[PDB]
Design a protein around this ligand. Structure first.
Ligand SMILES: [K+]
Ligand SMILES: [K+]
Ligand SMILES: [K+]
Ligand SMILES: [K+]
Ligand SMILES: [Mg+2]
Ligand SMILES: [Mg+2]
Ligand SMILES: [Mg+2]
Ligand SMILES: [Mg+2]
Ligand SMILES: [Mg+2]
Ligand SMILES: [Mg+2]
Ligand SMILES: [Mg+2]
Ligand SMILES: [Mg+2]
Ligand SMILES: [Mg+2]
Ligand SMILES: [Mg+2]
Ligand SMILES: [Mg+2]
Ligand SMILES: [Mg+2]
Ligand SMILES: [Mg+2]
Ligand SMILES: [Mg+2]
Ligand SMILES: [Mg+2]
Ligand SMILES: [Mg+2]
Ligand SMILES: [Mg+2]
Ligand SMILES: [Mg+2]
Ligand SMILES: [Mg+2]
Ligand SMILES: [Mg+2]
Ligand SMILES: [Mg+2]
Ligand SMILES: [Mg+2]
Ligand SMILES: [Mg+2]
Ligand SMILES: [Mg+2]
Lengths: 171, 101, 49, 79, 197, 510, 132, 88, 311
RNA sequence: GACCUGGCGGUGCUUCAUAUCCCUCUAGAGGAGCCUGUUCUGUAAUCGAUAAACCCCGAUCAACCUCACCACCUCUUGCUCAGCCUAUAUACCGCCAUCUUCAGCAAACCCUGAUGAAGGCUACAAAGUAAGCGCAAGUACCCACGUAAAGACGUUAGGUCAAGGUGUAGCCCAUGAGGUGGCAAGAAAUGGGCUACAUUUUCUACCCCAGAAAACUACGAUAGCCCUUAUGAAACUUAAGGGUCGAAGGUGGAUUUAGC
RNA sequence: AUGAUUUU
């Protein structure tokens, strides 16, 4: 039925299942997580399967100084449009599947030795483009809470330096 | 394109009950009086029994027109309780609010 | 009239004047299942038969 | 609340007084008593038009004509 | 090129002395670009203020009386004054109205919203008449009261007849008048079986 | 209620983003809305079953699915008449041929109706020949169809056949004038001959006959001026009241592209006196063109009083509905506003500007130029920045003709400091418009006069640094600053005691 | 705990409007109804019909104007006239807005056999009442 | 328009009902809804048919959405010709 | 954060809209008040939301917008107040002034409530703590107790607000005269779903007509007659007045209580002021708010709960 | 080995619970009959809830329909651009339960612990400032009282794939659709409720001044049997009324519920 | 007096 339908957000929220008791105490793995895909990205208003051309929405309102009439693309032309849309979708999927190489630190999966880039500028027009920040240790410390039980927190040690004798560290 | 086959059967029963409705009324009028002869009344009983089953008005159930729920349906809006509450909470129903007194 | 309320919107969507997020979600999921390998068996094609 | 709705220009006497349609029906007997009840119900009915009110009477006349043999068994004569 | 820029609201072009009824001729949804009123609506947040008229859905959810300003109402009534007649001066009091028009007719019209306007409650017609006005002697008065039964209230000396059988209001009115006529004539008529009272 | 000035036309939305800015945008938005209505109607007609559910009481026939199909498929006269009513020209003629081959009789009225459909929308000639009996109605409609199809000689020949055996005479008059290119007197003699035929047949000429004659006489620019009055006297003698199209034909004929136009002035004066205080009704398809043609005469004669008489006649009662289509209303409003700016007090002209623009129409770039010229004549230059803001609102930001006129007018003479600062702000806004021209996709224009005026205004307002930036634009765009501009630069340098600036002015001057 | 039409708290960067930030118990106290009609009145009828029409109209407008509507719709009925008021964005061109408005009004008028009039109020962005 | 009018406020009506708060096995917890109908009666006396028709048309067209109107008539009539005297 | 320039723009917009609103309503723009603005807003934009702040409001920007203090540091960044680096300059400067006045006084030697905390925040703009409020009140009280000068008395009165002390004296119905000239008083009483209107004459034969029926016949229960005797017997006026009372709604006991309240209030127009006060202190002039409590869903009754099973 | 936090303690002290822990106050349940759920037994015959937080619960409700169960039979692009009340509530959206008859949850900063998990208060003040949610305040009913409503973050992988939608997995001559017929009971136990065991009662007039009955013809079934009536096409079955009979029950074991 | 094994 038409009324037994939901919106994109109402469907993706259920499909992704980000909430729930599973993702609260490490009861599920992150490997099988699926990412949300926008279905309104490549779609243009006025495009249909039948390939009708509506003046003012799908095609320009006036052509050669005259108002266009309602037209319909040929079967071959519509097949070309469908093939173009499929090719664009596959290219977009390929770009997402492309992986950007990241320089590893002391080890392949170790956060130590990885640079965090220049420090964030201060609110008073102060910049630290000369300084460089690198990570030394990332540790997941835990504490016990009455309600939630184990409480997970991240402790990170970093070091900043400019290369001219001025340097420091913080946690 | 209805919600389910149960709703589709209910629609068919309503359509077949809307038909044959006057014929049932006329025959049942003969059956529901003592003035007419008993033999004629018995023949009317045979005719109304021989009428199609789906034409019987008691086979119609007031299901939800949104989720095909056979129970928990308000007759004024023809909606199930869950759908009615969802619309009322969203505010899409005029003049309906939470009752506090 | 659920037949009217469904076919009319289906016609509008095929004419490019109505966008249905739910229908797009179903089509995308069906396409992904076909790519994964799980495709709807055709009528008369009995896997158990 | 009634614009665009006319019941063929019928009047109150046509809608109510349906005894003129019982000329075929016998004026005495249980059949007459039953038809008096039917006509009284049709006259009190506000949701029916004159055409369908006559149609109910026509159906009863046809049904009684078909079942005249049963009426003969029960010592009743129709038309 | 940059996206199309919305023009400044026409309230700036509007002057203080303006024909507001002309600005809002009929009932229209609230438009901040057309209403030169800095009206705010909405429950304020902590250390906040009610939301501005631009984008305020609450203002849009209010049936506005902009088209019904007092100046507009007076002007509309002045134009419509040509369409109205004058009540008779002789019927100054309700007693005189009752004296000249003993029969009163009551009917109800219903205004609804939606594609359909049909309403079965619009067929009811009520006819009230005082039996004192009717030319009734002792026999006719008593027979009429017995015939009508509870339809006549002795305290008010008023006979009330309600007709709803007829599908149309005009047919109900005709039936009500016909019932009153036959009741009056039969009440005056004397039958032999009445001697067994 | 009364007409409101700040509001846009009622057809458009009342949203700042949705309201049109220019006349071209106004036309495009209406066409887009009409396109949407056509698309919706096409969907309804293509799929009627989705809308066959009556829920409104009383019934609304217009809001119902449309059916234009020959339901009766049987080959019969009744179904043939149905297709004639449905105006299916191809189906009707094929069915008529099949009916004729079958041998069943066809009524004369049905045959005449088929001819009327074919003539308005060969096959018609073949059917006309195949008619066992050709009646005067069939001859008349065939002549009218030929005249509509520009077969004037064929129509005249058919009329000769009819003679051997009102609208017809109108077709004949058009046919005689258009088929041949003889002299005006010969065409007038042909018209008189047709009138003599009309008298012989006892047929009364009508308003359409008179309008067709006048438009045919209009084809001769000057030869048929006096005969137009003769036709007009004939109309009065018969008793036919002239229509707006009749007056439109008279003015377009009597008034020609000539210098004196003394008789044209007399004709329009008499027509306005004749039509003063009179309401009008639709009588002829050319009634709309009357007001635009009259306004053109008013603009040509430079008679604003006459234009106000035309405007007053338009606003009398329901005569405003005869203003005409969009192109007619644009021409009428533009000429009316231009004449107002030319021959009226500036204060009343501003009142007319507020009442008309933009409620009546979106002004053209030339109209805005004329308004600036009127302000220049009135020596009220404080409104020039306001006109620039109006031009930006109305879509005249990048025409570059108004920009040059505004800059030249502001920098023409010195002003009090308050007005000078306002002019400097307007010049900066125009400078930003030049920096953001949509024409920059092809080329960017920085006129030397525009650069000089902006720099002069900045210097007079005290924007010395901005003037140096303007000088940088001068050497960037290969434009030479004027001597007066250099003198102002030297004065500023001397005030600031800056020999470096003085050397800079000398260097750029050399 | 209740979770009926309530936008729960979050990190604090979630923008919400006035309608969606107010819980259903605030109806008729701090916010009004999104639809007005005489169906839900003592003695009146066709409440179910109005509800079905309102649901279809909201879904039809949502699909007809993808990425355009900012807030919910205000539906009003006066006799035979139907008024649909929407707050939309400005991303689309005015030609597309006018084309859809004309198409939507004509299609709905023929479908529901009543004069349907659509009004649009464009805003630069979605109005944020608060950040939950 | 010069019409004598009297306005009073009839008592309001509140229609309340209850529904299940949850979807399952939670009969105890309920959610209660209500519909409030406020009445306003305006009685206009001593007017003619033409004046009444104009007034009704004006108010009905200006009636805001979500408001229902019921107009009760009181028409004055004389005795019918047949009931003038007892012919029977 | 709202700047002063934004406030000025809102004030200008408010003035323009006020003149436009007066033009719309067809009244004099000069003699237009906030009440006139409120009436116009209510009529033009009718809102039935129970919370008033959710309705459309058009007031002055000063009242609508909150109050913010000016920036203490200028272009050079130097704060303008000596006690700026305390974070609560307004409070501490006020405490400094009070302490200074206390030193000066040492050298020299019902409706007034102390300022509430919330209004103290408004006066001092900056936020204060509960104990900060307590310390400020303590200093003001100590200042008031000490010998106050003219300036000190003015300073103390600055931080005080007037309180209207409502009197508990029972109102007296005006005495009316009937056709016969007899004096009488008319009053009303209300019990739970019971309403009674009583007309009590100054002099009479001690009769009490309830709905045209004598009391012993209308209320056969002795307790109801005890209720009717309570007012007159209390003021020692038993049998010296006549009462004609009509009661409707409720049970027999509710009707008796409603009549008792109506007669007692009507009798107050004939008894002395001390007797009126004594009746009020005896409970004869106070309406009883005890009414039937609504039943709640999920419960057998108002407070009664369903049977609870541990397992 | 020594610590941080939480939980727990038949762990100390102080104040405490206001239908509330005990001594107290009222009326009940548990024993009788009946109505209605559940557990076990039986048939060919659904499913779910099933400590507090299930048990007149999904149902503001089942002779056909509902029905999703079973037996038999019938149909194959199937009312649907299919369909599936099929397995997973331990993938979820959506409505909820409970602590809550709480008051805490905290973004963004700063400080302390030698820069460890972590902690951050003393008012005659000693490192905390705090946006926001909740509480509070407003709002609804008869007031400012009371009752509603509201009640965050989280716990119980709590309940709901059978309101509806949906991820994954499964079938497509069947785990889909339709027709006919049929079960939904009691060996036994138990939850909730109704009616009684009577004299502060039973019948009658009355709605509060009476007359009768009152221990084997007293009280007491809404139980059983027969008849009639109402709806329905279909009433041995649903309901109401009348007729017939007058059973257990004589204040209830351990235990337990609600009320300011 | 007791609370089956693996489940961050
Ligand atoms: K017990
Ligand atoms: K599932
Ligand atoms: K029990
Ligand atoms: K294991
Ligand atoms: Mg690796
Ligand atoms: Mg049923
Ligand atoms: Mg709860
Ligand atoms: Mg109780
Ligand atoms: Mg028991
Ligand atoms: Mg079970
Ligand atoms: Mg189970
Ligand atoms: Mg079955
Ligand atoms: Mg069954
Ligand atoms: Mg199945
Ligand atoms: Mg399992
Ligand atoms: Mg769960
Ligand atoms: Mg309170
Ligand atoms: Mg509660
Ligand atoms: Mg609260
Ligand atoms: Mg579980
Ligand atoms: Mg379970
Ligand atoms: Mg199966
Ligand atoms: Mg008993
Ligand atoms: Mg019995
Ligand atoms: Mg029966
Ligand atoms: Mg007995
Ligand atoms: Mg053991
Ligand atoms: Mg263990």
């Amino acid at each position: 039925s038409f009324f037994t339908k939901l919106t994109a957000d109402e469907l993706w929220k259920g499909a992704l299942a980000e909430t729930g008791a599973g993702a609260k105490k490490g009861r599920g793995k992150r490997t099988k997580k699926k990412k949300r895909k926008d279905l309104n990205r490549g779609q243009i208003i006025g495009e249909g399967r039948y390939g009708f051309l509506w003046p003012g929405l799908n095609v320009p309102l006036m052509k050669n100084g005259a108002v266009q009439t309602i037209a319909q693309r040929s079967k071959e032309e519509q097949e070309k449009v469908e093939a173009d849309m499929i090719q664009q979708r596959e290219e977009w999927d390929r770009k997402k599947k492309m992986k950007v190489k990241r320089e590893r630190g002391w080890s392949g999966n170790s956060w130590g030795g990885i640079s965090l880039g220049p420090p964030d500028p201060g609110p008073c027009g102060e910049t630290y483009e000369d300084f460089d920040t690198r990570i030394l240790e990332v540790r997941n410390v835990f504490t016990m809470t009455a309600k939630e039980g184990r409480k997970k927190s991240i402790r990170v040690l970093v070091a900043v330096g400019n290369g001219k004798g001025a340097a420091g560290f913080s946690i | 394109h209805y919600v389910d086959w149960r709703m589709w059967r209910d629609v068919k029963r309503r359509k077949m009950a809307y038909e044959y409705a006057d014929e049932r009324l006329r025959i049942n009028s003969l059956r529901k009086n003592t003035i007419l002869p008993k033999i004629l009344q018995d023949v009317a009983d045979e005719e109304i029994a021989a009428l199609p089953r789906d034409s019987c008005p008691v086979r119609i159930r007031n299901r939800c027109v949104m989720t095909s729920r056979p129970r928990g349906v308000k007759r004024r809006w023809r909606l199930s309780r869950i759908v009615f509450r969802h619309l009322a909470d969203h505010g899409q129903l005029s003049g309906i609010q939470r009752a506090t007194w | 009239n659920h037949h009217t309320y469904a076919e009319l919107m289906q016609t509008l969507r095929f004419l490019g004047l109505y966008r249905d997020e739910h229908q797009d979600f179903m089509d995308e999921q069906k396409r992904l299942k076909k790519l994964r390998g799980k495709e709807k068996p055709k009528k008369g094609e009995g896997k158990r038969a | 609340n009634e614009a665009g709705f006319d019941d063929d220009g019928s009047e109150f006497h046509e809608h109510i007084f349906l005894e003129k349609h019982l000329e075929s029906f016998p004026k005495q007997g249980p059949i007459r008593h039953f038809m008096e009840l039917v006509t009284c119900g049709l006259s009190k009915n506000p949701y029916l038009s004159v055409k369908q009110k006559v149609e109910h009477i026509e159906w009863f006349r046809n049904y009684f004509n078909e079942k005249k043999d049963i009426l003969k068994e029960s010592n009743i004569q129709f038309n | 090129p940059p996206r199309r820029k919305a023009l400044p609201p026409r309230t700036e072009k509007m002057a203080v002395d303006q024909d507001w009824p002309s600005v809002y001729p009929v009932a229209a949804p609230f438009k901040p670009s057309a209403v030169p009123l800095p009206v705010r609506m909405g429950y304020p947040v902590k250390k906040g203020v009610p939301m501005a008229k631009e984008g305020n859905l609450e203002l849009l959810k209010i049936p506005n009386f902009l088209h019904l300003t007092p100046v507009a109402i007076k002007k509309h009534c002045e134009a419509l004054k040509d369409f109205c007649t004058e009540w008779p001066a002789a019927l100054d009091s309700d007693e005189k109205c009752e004296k000249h028009f003993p029969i009163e007719i009551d009917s109800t019209d219903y205004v609804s919203s939606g594609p359909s306007v049909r309403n079965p409650r619009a067929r009811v017609v009520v006819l009230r008449v005082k039996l004192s006005s009717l030319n009734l002697d002792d026999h006719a008065k008593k027979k009429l009261i017995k015939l009508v039964g509870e339809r006549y209230c002795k305290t008010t000396d008023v006979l009330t007849i309600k007709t709803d059988r007829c599908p149309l209001r005009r047919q109900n009115y005709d039936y009500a008048v016909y019932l009153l006529t036959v009741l009056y004539h039969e009440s005056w008529n004397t039958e032999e079986w009445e001697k067994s009272k | 209620v009364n007409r409101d000035t700040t509001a846009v036309p009622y057809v458009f939305q009342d949203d700042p983003y949705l309201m049109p800015a220019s006349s071209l945008e106004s036309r495009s938005f209406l066409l887009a809305k009409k396109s949407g209505e056509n698309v919706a109607k096409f969907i309804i007609n293509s799929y009627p079953k989705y809308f066959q559910k009556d829920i409104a009481e009383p019934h609304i026939p217009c809001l119902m699915p449309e059916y234009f199909e020959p339901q009766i498929k049987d080959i019969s006269e009744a179904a043939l008449k149905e297709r004639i009513e449905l105006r299916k020209v191809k189906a009707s003629v094929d069915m008529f041929d099949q009916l004729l081959q079958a041998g069943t009789t066809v009524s004369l009225e049905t045959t005449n109706s088929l001819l009327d459909l074919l003539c308005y929308y060969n096959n018609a000639e073949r059917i006309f020949s195949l008619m066992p009996e050709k009646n005067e109605h069939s001859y008349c409609t065939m002549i009218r169809g030929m005249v509509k199809h520009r077969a004037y000689e064929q129509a005249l020949n058919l009329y000769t056949e009819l003679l051997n055996n009102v609208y017809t005479f109108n077709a004949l008059i058009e046919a005689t004038v258009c088929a041949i290119n003889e002299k005006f007197e010969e065409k007038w003699s042909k018209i008189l001959e047709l009138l003599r035929h009309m008298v012989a047949q006892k047929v009364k000429p009508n308003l359409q006959t008179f309008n067709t004659i006048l438009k045919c006489l209009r084809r001769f620019h000057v030869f048929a001026r006096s005969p137009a009055l003769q036709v007009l006297r004939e109309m009065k003698a018969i008793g036919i009241e002239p229509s707006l199209a009749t007056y439109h034909h008279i003015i377009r004929l009597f008034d020609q592209p000539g210098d004196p136009l003394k008789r044209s002035s007399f004709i329009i004066y008499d027509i306005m006196n004749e039509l003063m205080g009179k309401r009008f009704s639709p009588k002829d398809p050319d009634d709309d063109k009357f007001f635009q043609s009259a306004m053109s005469i008013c603009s040509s004669l430079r008679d604003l009083e006459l234009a106000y008489q035309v405007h007053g006649l338009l606003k009398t009662g329901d005569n405003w509905k005869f203003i005409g289509p969009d192109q007619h209303r644009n021409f009428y409003y533009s000429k009316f506003f231009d004449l107002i700016c030319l021959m009226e007090q500036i204060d009343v002209t501003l009142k007319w500007y507020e009442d008309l623009i933009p409620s009546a129409y979106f002004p053209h770039s030339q109209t805005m130029i004329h308004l600036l010229q009127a302000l220049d004549v009135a020596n009220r230059l404080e409104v020039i920045p306001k006109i620039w803001k109006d031009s930006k609102e109305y879509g005249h930001t990048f025409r570059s003709d108004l920009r040059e006129e505004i800059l030249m007018l502001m920098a023409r003479d010195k002003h009090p400091p308050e007005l000078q600062v306002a002019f400097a702000d307007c010049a900066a806004d125009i400078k930003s418009a030049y920096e953001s021209q949509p024409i920059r996709q092809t080329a960017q224009d920085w006129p030397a006069t525009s650069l000089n005026c902006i720099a002069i205004l900045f210097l007079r307002a005290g924007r010395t640094q901005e003037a140096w930036k303007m000088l940088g634009l001068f050497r960037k765009h290969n434009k030479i600053p004027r001597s007066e501009l250099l003198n102002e630069l030297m004065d500023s340098a001397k005030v600031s005691n800056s020999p470096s600036q003085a050397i800079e002015v000398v260097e750029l001057a050399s | 705990k209740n979770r009926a039409a309530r936008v729960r708290v979050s990190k604090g960067d979630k923008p919400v409007t006035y309608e969606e930030a107010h819980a259903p118990h605030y109806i008729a106290h701090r916010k009004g109804w999104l639809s007005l009609h005489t169906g839900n009145l003592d003695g009146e009828d066709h409440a179910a019909e109005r509800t079905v029409e309102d649901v279809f109209l909201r879904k039809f407008m949502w699909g007809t104007f993808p990425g355009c509507l900012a807030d919910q719709l205000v539906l009003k009925r006066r006799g035979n006239q139907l008024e649909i008021c929407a707050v939309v964005l400005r991303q689309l061109s005015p030609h597309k807005y006018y084309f859809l408005v004309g198409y939507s009004e004509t299609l709905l008028s023929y479908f529901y056999k009543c004069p349907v009039r659509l009004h649009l109020q464009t805003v630069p962005s979605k109005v944020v009442y608060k950040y939950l | 328009l010069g019409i004598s009018i009297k306005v009073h406020e009839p008592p309001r009506k509140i229609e309340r009902f209850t529904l299940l708060q949850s979807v399952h096995i939670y009969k105890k917890h309920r959610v209660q809804y209500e519909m409030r109908t406020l009445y306003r009666c305006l009685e206009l006396e001593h007017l003619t048919g033409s004046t009444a028709d104009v007034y009704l048309e004006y108010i009905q067209r200006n009636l805001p959405e979500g408001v229902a109107m019921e107009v009760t008539k009181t028409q004055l009539e004389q005795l019918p010709e047949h009931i003038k005297e007892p012919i029977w | 954060t709202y700047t002063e320039d934004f406030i000025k723009k809102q004030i200008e917009e408010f003035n323009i809209g006020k003149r436009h609103l007066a033009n719309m309503m067809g009244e004099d723009p000069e003699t237009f008040t906030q009440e006139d603005i409120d009436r116009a807003i209510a009529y033009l934009f009718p809102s039935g939301l129970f919370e008033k702040r959710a309705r459309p409001v058009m007031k002055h920007p000063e009242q609508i917008f909150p109050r913010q203090r000016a920036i203490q540091w200028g272009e050079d960044g130097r704060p303008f107040h000596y006690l700026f680096y305390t974070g609560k300059q307004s409070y501490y400067s006020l405490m400094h002034d009070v302490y200074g006045m206390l030193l000066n006084l040492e050298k020299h030697q019902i409706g007034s409530r102390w300022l509430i905390k919330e209004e103290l925040e408004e006066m001092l703009v900056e936020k204060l703590s509960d104990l900060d409020y307590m310390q400020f009140i303590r200093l003001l009280e100590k200042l008031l107790t000490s010998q106050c000068g003219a300036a000190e008395e003015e300073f103390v009165q600055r931080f005080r607000r007037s309180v209207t002390l409502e009197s508990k004296k029972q109102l007296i119905e005006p005495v009316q005269y009937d056709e016969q000239g007899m004096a009488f008083s008319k009053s009303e009483g209300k019990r739970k779903t019971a309403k009674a209107e009583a007309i009590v004459y100054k002099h009479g034969s001690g009769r009490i007509k309830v709905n045209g029926i004598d009391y012993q016949l209308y209320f056969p229960i002795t307790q109801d007659r005890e209720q009717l005797m309570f007012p007159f017997h209390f003021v020692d006026r038993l049998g010296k007045h006549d009462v004609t009372c009509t009661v409707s709604g409720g049970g027999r006991s509710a009707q008796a209580g409603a009549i008792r309240l109506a007669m007692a209030k009507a009798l107050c127009s004939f008894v002395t002021e001390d007797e009126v006060e004594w009746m009020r202190q005896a409970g004869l002039l106070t309406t009883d708010p005890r009414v039937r409590e609504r039943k709640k869903p999920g419960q057998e009754g108002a407070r009664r709960k369903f049977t609870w099973k541990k397992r």
